[PDB]
Design a protein around this ligand. Structure first.
Ligand SMILES: *[C@@H]1O[C@H](CO)[C@@H](O[C@@H]2O[C@H](CO)[C@@H](O[C@@H]3O[C@H](CO[C@H]4O[C@H](CO[C@H]5O[C@H](CO)[C@@H](O)[C@H](O)[C@@H]5O)[C@@H](O)[C@H](O[C@H]5O[C@H](CO)[C@@H](O)[C@H](O)[C@@H]5O)[C@@H]4O)[C@@H](O)[C@H](O[C@H]4O[C@H](CO)[C@@H](O)[C@H](O)[C@@H]4O[C@H]4O[C@H](CO)[C@@H](O)[C@H](O)[C@@H]4O)[C@@H]3O)[C@H](O)[C@H]2NC(C)=O)[C@H](O)[C@H]1NC(C)=O
Ligand SMILES: [Cl-]
Ligand SMILES: [Zn+2]
Ligand SMILES: [Zn+2]
Length: 341
């Protein structure tokens, strides 16, 4: 005591100290932290159906908005989920989401905190549709410095500030569609900003456990974690691409994600695996929901600065973030209007 229980592979657990937990992370191992829960097909459209509408919404994306939000978000000393910094950064992000909702005038759209047993709350923004079939867009809002998690500097600009501002800007543009804002889409859309991802997927485990216990009908979940770093790709002489993960994800949903990238982005896809417990999509998968995951690059070309003080906004390519904004908008809109899910 304190003893943390980690799940490193299906049905395989290890009891560790907190220091050993961060040492595992530093070696590249991921896991679910299951300390508090110690014993714990959908067919998609074959092609895009709303190309004219989505192409017009894409013209409203503004890459200056990514940097306007990411700069002050990264100025929190860290956004560590067990720190008062992480409570304050979540409250700040909640205020930014609320400013977008209030300025849209969309009567039924809300954001609410999801409480956890640590100071940093997750955030869920909801766009009600005509049915409770739900499409989820996710990113994690916490950051960590693995050499000193509680008090170490962690700007978290790429990991995962980039994903946060990607889906926040897609959320803003979605609310400019009159039918979506009025609640007339056949399906409900939610934007999730997960707390405590760096501690072992703590916030997304809580959310999808509760959704499963309440029989929430999640028809698709897309996670984005690190959407901004292209220098590794360009240094290697490789084509700028959207990375698509192929393990711990739903195969049909991943095929649909590639349809979305082919239709709405101007760069190609590149497949990789990233292992067990890799990001918050793994929590959706664990609790039985179909999930997919996109990120910045091919395997091994991602930011080498993550989990340190050097994960700064100067490493982020906002033209690449814009490509992820386009795919987020297309994924959300096409599935919001997929009445056969
Ligand atoms: C959703 O909706 C959106 C709309 O919002 C849809 O957008 C459409 O998307 C498609 C696909 O992405 C686009 O098609 C592609 O468009 C470009 C057109 O680019 C213009 O420039 C060309 C180059 O011109 C320069 O160079 C010439 C050299 O001769 C100069 O003379 C010029 O001055 C320029 O400097 C130009 O050639 C094009 O002209 C053609 O189109 C006009 C407009 O209709 C005609 O007047 C012309 O006569 C001529 O037909 C154009 O003005 C093209 O480059 C793409 O063509 C390639 O791909 C075709 C399909 O594969 C293929 O048949 C062509 O031969 C061509 O192939 C060439 O390129 C390949 C690589 O790309 C090579 O491998 C190959 O060897 C060959 O060299 C293609 O036409 C639409 O433009 C775009 N439309 C709009 C309105 O935005 C979107 O499709 C929708 N999505 C869905 C439904 O999923
Ligand atoms: Cl990471
Ligand atoms: Zn991350
Ligand atoms: Zn991380």
């Amino acid at each position: 005591d304190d003893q943390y229980v980690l799940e490193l592979a299906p049905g395989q657990t290890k009891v560790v100290t907190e220091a050993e937990k961060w040492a595992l992370r530093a070696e590249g191992k991921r896991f679910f932290d299951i300390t508090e829960r110690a014993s714990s097909a959908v067919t998609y459209p074959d092609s895009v159906q709303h190309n004219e509408t989505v192409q017009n919404l894409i013209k409203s994306l503004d890459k200056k908005n990514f940097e306007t939000v990411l700069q002050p978000f990264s100025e929190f000393h860290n956004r560590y989920y067990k720190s008062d910094n992480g409570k304050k950064s979540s409250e700040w992000l909640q205020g930014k989401i609320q400013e977008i909702i209030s300025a849209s005038g969309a009567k039924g759209v809300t954001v609410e905190p999801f409480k956890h047993s640590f100071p940093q709350s997750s955030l869920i923004a909801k766009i009600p549709g005509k049915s409770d079939k739900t499409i989820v867009l996710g990113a994690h809002q916490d950051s960590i410095n693995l050499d000193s998690p509680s008090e170490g500097r962690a700007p978290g600009a790429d990991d995962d500030g980039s994903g946060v501002v990607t889906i926040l800007e897609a959320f803003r543009v979605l609310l400019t569609d009159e039918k979506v804002a009025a609640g007339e889409a056949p399906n409900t859309v939610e934007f999730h900003f997960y707390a405590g991802e760096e501690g072992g997927l703590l916030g997304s485990q809580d959310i999808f456990e509760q959704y499963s216990q309440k029989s929430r009908d999640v028809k698709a979940m897309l996670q984005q974690d690190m959407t901004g770093y292209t220098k590794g790709t360009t240094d290697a002489g490789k084509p700028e691409s959207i990375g698509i993960i192929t393990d711990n994800v739903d195969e049909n949903l991943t095929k649909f994600l590639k349809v979305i990238v082919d239709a709405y982005c101007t760069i190609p896809t590149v497949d990789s695996k990233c292992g067990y417990g890799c990001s918050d999509h793994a929590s959706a998968t664990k609790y039985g929901y179909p999930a997919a995951f996109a990120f910045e690059s091919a395997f091994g070309d991602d930011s080498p600065y993550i989990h340190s003080a050097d994960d700064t906004i100067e490493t982020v390519n906002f033209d690449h973030v814009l490509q992820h904004g386009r795919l987020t908008l297309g994924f959300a809109y096409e599935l919001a209007f997929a009445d056969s899910l």
